[model samples]
Target: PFISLLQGDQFLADTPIPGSAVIPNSGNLFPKWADKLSPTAVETWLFDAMAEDGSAAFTVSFFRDGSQAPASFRAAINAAWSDGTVWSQHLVVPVSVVTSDGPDVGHGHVAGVWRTETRTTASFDVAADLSTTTVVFDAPGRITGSLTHRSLGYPTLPQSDREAEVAPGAYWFRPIAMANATVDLTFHIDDKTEKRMVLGPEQGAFGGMDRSWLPMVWGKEATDALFVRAQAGPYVMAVMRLVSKPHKYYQNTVNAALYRDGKIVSNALRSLPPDRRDTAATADAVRTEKLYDGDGLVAKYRDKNVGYRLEFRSAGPEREKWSFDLRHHQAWWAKPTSRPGPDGTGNSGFVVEVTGGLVGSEESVHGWGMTGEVELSDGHH
Candidate 1:
């Protein structure tokens, strides 16, 4: 039983707004109380090695209102993963029964919805091979876990009774395959400090989007041939996978697809567009110059800056004369702007400026919103 810990890419995508009205339907499904701009949701990958190799085993748990989540949800999760991977052909694993852990009080629940604290643990039948990029156990292991749902903050929200629409969600595994067996494993959520940095408070502006800017694909690692080796049944590979969709902000959505023996087993399409932004022209007119080729699905970032461009066809009746510059810097230090606040804590706006990405003003009859694509290129993973 060898145990090793690894860290995966911590790519994060977020939308930070300055006020409270951003919450859809008054913070029922969405819950951010203050106007100073805080994170809505977060996304990252969790990688770890199992003790066995011949078979796989795992356990997952959930909590609600700061308490342990119900065992029923855990079963649901196990069953979901099991069916989700049938055709794709992953090393099978079984999960243990859900048990009750004592309640843990964290930040509490949202004002008007049921909230629960949830944790999940799973064991695989196979002993992980650290040398290989994909962990292929002799057999697929068992999985066990639960989800906790509570009515904690429902009463405090404005439209508490209004049935909220739940988004489609899923999970899957990706193997490095024989061609690229020597893959690196990275971990993202084991402690408070790591979690705090990974889930920093800066994802509410766009709408609770959860796919962390963390890169899923490593830098320049050719994935075309990587799929073939993973299909060889003698080897079962286990890599990193997302656990849940984020709760706040709206932007790039991710779907997990399973590839077996160089064939697509399941296509998990991302839920939303890759990029979203509103832009305005700046004094530095590089007009006719398109920021990006617009071939892929994410917004392009400027060099060495934390700003991205959102291009719109034309500016409408709004403040078109103002010079607003938006740039997307890869480094975390590209600090955003701050709107003066009545309280001590000021509102932090994104450091990005829109060079020529604003669309639809008060004048245009064919009002349109600035649209652009954002891509989480390989590297950070």
Candidate 2:
């Protein structure tokens, strides 16, 4: 049984659900288009229910300009995904359709109408455990469908450049967008033993920068078992999960470091104390503060003997700016003070490589940590 189109408690037309066969086609039920001489408009109806036999079909027609009258078109099943299975079937349109009237002349039957035919097919499959999915297309086309469970999905990395060299174990994914082209994806589940695949469009850029989506598994397991290390220019940061045995949980630990021409200039670690009830003890522990007002960071460890301050500025007319000052007098072995300049008071400065814009500004701190060490800092900016 198909569904009925309603207009304020009134019956207009009958339509079928998405997985059902075609319903009677209807048009001209509304006079708004004719009133304005609009060039294009679409009338869509919903599917009442899925077919009882698990198989269904439908048809759509593109009409001539302003008339809402069918030109010439027919059926072509483009893509289908059936309960963990993928299949594709292509059908060639038998009839030719006149697409354009071409420069009209004052003569009879000037330039016969332009015509063409099209064929398309695509297939996709999802795993039972929701770990992976696969898609295949006989030709270039878009596939639209829905999934049962609300699992995170991302696009597969391209097969070129360093992205292709990314380790199979650690990776990220993200939502698909219009500007994206064909994509092939593989999902790494949190179980540490499961993996999945997804094939679709490329992901869109975010904030004028390209970023990939990480799966839900990473989000769930990050609390107990995850470590990320990244570098931006000369600044370096590492983040890891600090597991508490008795409580059987984990907290977060962040370590920020700086390097000048492959040499360590400063390092600091900050973490939340396990005992939340002891405010005094928490205050005594390694203290860290992040100020986004100017993208600055301050870290103090074991009294004031060892401290670090960093200010990161956004890209400007010429280059990105990063300035830092390090003070260490505690452990003699690690006593090294550095400043930002060419002065020879044991105080040295560094400037990182920058093009038109900062390279790592678009990435999240956690995401940048995965890029390993940075070596762009050169002393004496």
Candidate 3:
């Protein structure tokens, strides 16, 4: 048990993974007091979403650190189509500049641009005057769009951020949990061209964001795997579930915000699995029991564990799936890309945003998908 005492967020939640704050109205803001400048420190911002018409799923992120040789400013873009096609772009340029303009204008934000590539230039920005976010790529047509983040669930949306102490002195803060966005974009990739396609749900597209500040250099192997996303039908469900590597007891914890038919059902509420189905009760239990179909996937948790069990069979037929090490995405400092599962079965697997229906345990109801995505394993296993 000496090695298992690494979470401060646990003490506050009374549960292994607490969801709601003692109160959302008076919770903390993303503070500016950490030593984020230390070479050993880490911080990142990631945003992802699904188009309303099930056309495509998009993911973008900016990673920064104290590494000057390899340079700290890094950007990544991942888009998965309905036919299992993926566009993966990684920019690890050393001569680029990154300036956050010091947080959103609470007041103002200045974006950082990448111009190192011979033909492709790109940048992303989250606006201060407005909650709108824009991401663009060169060729003047590679990717062009805007997602206007609108408040819904997560009571503190647009006003506050969600926090989780992943390690003793670090936090995984989410400034956005659920936002329905009005989408307008043009896409020109390889052999496909779509101009200003208005994939409309009328209420916007489902999306979310993540920002983390850490004291460690790379990763400490915190979780077996994780899935973070929001599916909005106006009746939105925003969730972040973390399945940890064993601490003697394998833990399945989640932080969720649920909005049903225009009612505030749960604000960062907590849940777990029931005893017979509890993964924590057994050692090295698999959370994702089996796959239903290419798109018919089921990820279950135990209610006795206070965890909300969910079955997601979604996105679309062409949704993406892949197996790679977690370091490739989150902690890119791992030198050579060579890490397999304990049995050399590969270290990670993920199913990109797909269209499907949802079934859950609390307030129990069903809703079809506007956009969905998940990861079943991440090398931690």
Candidate 4:
């Protein structure tokens, strides 16, 4: 069921639940063109396009062991002062990068470096590469790091030829937006692992001021289910959930919430009950809707109306429950420091504005702690 979604096969199998699986892979490659290129090639093209147009101005590109990867990545570029002196060209990597442990055998493991470079406004062509290679301590147990950085615009430097130095957190743009940059990523895995893959769009850009500018999804697990937060617009935010485990007897529950102006509107929780009972009606809906089998809950919004849909189906002849719950309140966004950035301002907070038609998990199965594809209609306003 999961495999079919990744490969773009809309055909879904059956389950005892009352719903159908929302297969992620109904079309060839997410943005359509992805099916035409190799993963490495896709990365190369993405970097080139960003350099030429600054569309994907800020991004975090990673390769992991999953059926899918993040759709977008971003960070804020700030200017700071230290020791009575203003500093710029600073870089920071907040998250530790790692690889996935496959759910099946023949899942070859790969080791690659998360590399980054910074370019100053004066000597924008001159860049300093910051890269870390992946290393495994013992056989079969592996740990790796993903590349992340913040660019503090270029400042006047004493040295003429040296361009600039690596400052802590001083710059005008985010580190991910440095000019004339390239990420030299290489992955080496055991040959025995099967090549089941995951990835984002081929030509999507990850820049601009609005949350919609970045095409990524940040996901995490809560209790027994999974929680997903995605920015749709500069002021619209949405939260959705999927069940952690499918029920053995019946269909499980899945829910979603939309937040704006300290208020939340949500879908009914009991709408999809926990009962191991599925019907062809739901299966047909899954196929028609192009939902992924692994997706227990799905939500989408149109104009002022928000849409909620849940499915429960198995590719194999087995019964399992996928349940989810959603919570939305101004309290959820109360954490001041949890805001997005550019200057510690809330401009980077969550918003809701989607471009793609179907809504599933933001990026990879295990999201990169970011939001989903938000349409930037109003720039940074």
Candidate 5:
């Protein structure tokens, strides 16, 4: 991977980029020890895919200590179909069960295989560029498949936020934000039934991955809630706001991005309020300027660059759809405002819509629906 001279909004205009003070880095994600920035830092990888036809969705999560030793390693998968059926399982194994075949982006293959019984097992194998992947679950009913990703993951970072500090001395990066994705797999029902699930343009579905790294105590420090979604089109949006806390040197911490048509178009990030230079201001702005117009939950974006304003509005009320826990109190939930996925299982959710740029401009796109989660600070130890 070559070091980039272009940074921040620079990527907002380029092709596939491995950077940021803006988007992020794929090379630095592995070999956590070598890149560890804090004593308490932890690294995580999350892969989420939602079908455009509202037929299915799935998520895979993996995380471990930055030190990479004597720390816990976990991998979990959750999937849902239009028939309102869901399947999930989480595995906890010794670090030795996992393997890293390459140290940098492009050529490395990171994988893990674990078994709970003689015939029950799950495994995930992925390439460094976040392009090639294989995921399998062989117990109960099975979900087994491999995927190919497009170079749709450019950078959607702001002009000055790369390797951004989330907590003092605690840093973060998003190497891949919703890279266009597709999976070809089979779902088994008992020993005699099977269904083919292929999600992408051919099936009128959309897909992508969220690949990020934050070296800090999960849910601790300034991090609060995060909402991210990328659809079938050339689109992706993310807004991660923090708690009331802030790093001593940098208090203006807001994570927002807007990528349209394979390019970084704008961001949903707000500026620091004059009275409060903390995230509260940013959160407040989100609640006031964007989340609503007169009714509720509309998407929005604004930047100081050229007075750009972008907005994303919902087509309907966000349905309280599905939820699963990370345990104790930490949980993940989704609310779909569009048609057909899995419903009546969650208590909250959001998808999006909007208007604006430099000062004012228009770009209208719809139907990605909403699916996401959170870890309350007090909820997790």
Candidate 6:
């Protein structure tokens, strides 16, 4: 008897010798069997050769090591052929066993808000590979949103544990309680760098009361100067500098500057609103004119320079609705100075304003200041 197995153009097994006495087949068949067997006795042998071209021809066999069949089975012939190549294939049969305990770990996409003891809340989205996060808080409370550039001389931890926790590389906004509070806030942590942005309660003389002192004073002073930067295209580079200063609360002189290739093209001190209180409706209605005269606190450079406007609004008893919009403009370099200059002489390319109740002020507060580029409208100037 001649027993041969062919899969398309490849041969998996062939026994071409006389075997009337039922002697075991040898040659390439034995080598293939030896490679697959594990000192187990054969339990079953199945064969099929329906296809004329030998494409569907296959054989499967089960084995028992002792008294029971093993969890693995051996398949040959067409089973060894995948596509146009000859390859070895082993299939493991699944078995069900009774157990009192189940899986211990659960994982999947989670969407919701995470509230901290300080009453700060962060909305987060965790998907397969993409994730997003945002944090909101009350006044006199400082929260870090993102950190860019090299690590600054900011304190590794807050002055008080009650203020916030310092977790390196983890990105989460931290709320500051004291004027002298310095804590690292991470918005997102990855293998390379920790991202951070700044947000805090409105500024006042005595905690959240009088608007005599700059808001920066209530936080831990930077050990060294801190720099926040943004870049667009090959020609524009925007930077905000927080200079460390001594105070009961950590205070920094805020400076805004624009650069082209590494040279300072325009620079100015950021103009911000005095920490004040108002109702949610009144706060949003308080136009840019009242905050910084005809020029809004953030739009001081609106005359010559272009700007991207980011407006954050929050409402409700708990100020639950927190959202922001980014408006981009393309225009001339209309720079403004605390001193006097032409319309296009000042350096102001972007502005960010956070307004709402529960933003660290009494009723509602606004954080606005001069702070991208592309192409679109000419804006006001």
Among these predictions, the greatest lDDT belongs to 5
Best by TM-score: 3
lDDT accuracy of residue 223 in candidate 5: 25
All models: lDDT? 0.19, 0.23, 0.40, 0.20, 0.42, 0.22
Residues 318-374, candidate 1, lDDT per residue (tens digit)? 433211223321111111122223211111111121232123423211110111112
The CA-based lDDT of model 6 is what?
0.22
- Listed per candidate, the RMSD to the true structure in angstroms reads 23.2, 26.2, 11.9, 23.0, 12.7, 32.3
Displacement of residue 378 (Cα, Å) in model 2 is 42
Candidate with more favorable, higher lDDT: 1 or 3: 3
Query: What are the TM-scores, per candidate, against the unseen true structure?
Result: 0.19, 0.17, 0.59, 0.21, 0.58, 0.17
Better of 2 and 6 by TM-score: 2
278-366 per-residue lDDT for model 6 (tens digits): 33432211111113222322334324222322212222234322211222221212223224534222333332332333234444433
lDDT tens digits by residue: candidate 3, 1-381: 001011111111122221222112221222121212344454566666666544556666665544322355556666655565556556654433344444332344535455554455556565543244555555354666654455343543323333354333444535555556554555666666664434354645566665555545323333333443434344455444444445524455444444446453444423344223322221111122223333332332211011123432222232211111111111101111233343221122233232222233223222233212222223342
Give the better candidate number (3 or 4) by lDDT: 3
Candidate numbers, best lDDT first, in rank order: 5, 3, 2, 6, 4, 1
Tell me the tens digit of each residue's lDDT in model 4 across 1-381.
Answer: 012111222111122111121112110101111222122111110111121221122222222111122321112121111112111111222221222223421121212222222321100111222111111111121111122222222221112111111111100111122212222222223333221111223322122111010111111111122223332222122222232212222122233322222232222122243332353222211110112333222222211112122232322233222222211111112122223443221112111112221134342111111222111111221
Lowest summed lDDT window (length 10), candidate 4: 164-173
Q: Positional deviation of 339 in candidate 1, in angstroms?
A: 39
Q: Cα deviation in Å at residue 140, candidate 2?
A: 11
Question: Worst 10-residue stretch by lDDT in candidate 5?
Answer: 320-329
Residues 1-381 of candidate 2 have per-residue lDDT tens digits of 111111121111223111111111111111112112222322221111111111211111112121222321222221111232222222222222211112321111111111232434333232322233233323323233321112222222232322211112222211110011223322222223322223232221110001111111122223222222223443332222222222224333433333333343323233443333222321112222222233212112211212232332322243333333222211111111323333211211111111111223453221121111111112221
Ranking by TM-score: 3, 5, 4, 1, 2, 6
Model 2 scores what on Cα lDDT?
Answer: 0.23
For candidate 1, give the lDDT of residue 85: 17
